[PDB]
């Protein structure tokens, strides 16, 4: 109950963030994969194109 002159550490100061921005891509993107849906010929079901 009695406090003398000096410095006493009570707690810690926390700067909580206010915003949360996340950006994985920059724009729309696509790598060539339509050849399996646009091939000259397809495969059968006994041996299908994985």
């Amino acid at each position: 109950f009695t406090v003398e002159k000096g410095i006493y550490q009570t707690s810690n100061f926390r700067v909580q963030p206010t915003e949360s921005i996340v950006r994985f891509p920059n724009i729309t993107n696509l790598c060539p994969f339509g050849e399996v849906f646009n091939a000259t010929r397809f495969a059968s079901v006994y041996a299908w194109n994985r």
């Binding site: 060539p32 495969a43 194109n49 994985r50």
Partner: protein, 49 residues
């Protein structure tokens, strides 16, 4: 280099590169190094001229 292919999944085209088809017998002027690695199914290519 081959006769024909049967079936596959991956086909990638890199950036265009120009070459000279003339062959000579003189001293070399460039050095090219390549490193090919295979970790957990991932092929790695490292190179510098």
């Amino acid at each position: 280099v081959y006769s024909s292919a049967n079936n596959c999944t991956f086909e990638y085209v890199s950036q265009p590169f120009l070459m000279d088809l003339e062959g000579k017998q003189g001293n070399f002027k460039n050095l090219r190094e390549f490193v090919f690695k295979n970790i957990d199914g991932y092929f790695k290519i490292y190179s510098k001229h």
